[PDB]
Design a protein around this nucleic acid. Sequence first.
DNA 1: CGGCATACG
DNA 2: CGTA
DNA 3: GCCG
Length: 325
Amino acid sequence: MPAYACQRPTPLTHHNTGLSEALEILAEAAGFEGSEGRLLTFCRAASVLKALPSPVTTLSQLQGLPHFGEHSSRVVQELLEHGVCEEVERVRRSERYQTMKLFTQIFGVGVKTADRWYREGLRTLDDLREQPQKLTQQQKAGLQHHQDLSTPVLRSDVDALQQVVEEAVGQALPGATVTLTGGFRRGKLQGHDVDFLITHPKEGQEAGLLPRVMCRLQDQGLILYHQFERSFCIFRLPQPGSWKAVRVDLVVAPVSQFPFALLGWTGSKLFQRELRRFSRKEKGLWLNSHGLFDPEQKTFFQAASEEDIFRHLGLEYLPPEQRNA
DNA sequence: CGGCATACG
DNA sequence: CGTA
DNA sequence: GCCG
Ligand SMILES: O=c1ccn([C@@H]2O[C@H](COP(=O)(O)NP(=O)(O)OP(=O)(O)O)[C@@H](O)[C@H]2O)c(=O)[nH]1
Ligand SMILES: [Mg+2]
Ligand SMILES: [Mg+2]
Ligand code: NA
């Protein structure tokens, strides 16, 4: 079991679901308290369990697994012994966890904003609504549409959205392409949003594309909210006899950078963080969604594929459905 | 102990 | 600050 | 919280 998540296949469904979900509760809680280091360790330990070929049944099976020290092991131990971990349950019940979770789930609200509101005594969504003076227009959108946005996006939702995005993209720039990314590209059956990557086979033609796409989407009455090369929108998605609000992210990249952007936006989030960490610390190369940079030779690696990028980094290729760290 | 991904809106 |  |  290698120490970086990008070094091992991590399937979407696995054999330690309960254990990983408990550790991810502690990761989340760590983030609510600003402790990014602890969040990372708990996320990594959870991911290690996702990568195992069978259930963890005894404590000794944790020996020699990366990212399992005294704390994470004790969490697993209690779950194995009693089916629950007191620390985890304590977090679950806490007013702090529940309110920070509720608040950060709002589009436009991050840990810093949630925390401030919490300290001001705010607890509920109606607490925010009954004082819209303090809200940004983004937060007002997030709050108005919160119920719909809390509803899982389904695969059938995605196909319908892709068609309408392709339609607008097609008028905006003939020959431009739309690629499904994010969680659904990794095989997820549900999602919190739909993520699309847009490019054109002729380098440079993609310049200026996103405002033209956005203009045409808005013209068809499909945009409930939007604010460039990235756009975080709320779409009006038809439903039987009605509609619902759905979060949709659009990203444009030149075709030269397409593999890097495909890699970066397909995730998982932890997978990308680990991959970038691996790149910098183990290979001395700087990776982002634009490219891979050798800071010694002052050169960018050209990639024609995600496979190229894994090869560059000396990693075995992992298809998207094995990047579910 | 230092480090913990990386960028755009 | 928010977002991915 | 854990690695190196
Ligand atoms: O902090 C972040 C967030 C997101 N991302 C990258 O953006 C992708 C989409 O970001 P996302 O927030 O849409 N997450 P996703 O994996 O689609 O799952 P879901 O919650 O169902 O939407 C992720 O899969 C990562 O590649 C990051 O690199 N960093
Ligand atoms: Mg997504
Ligand atoms: Mg997204
Ligand atoms: Na939020």
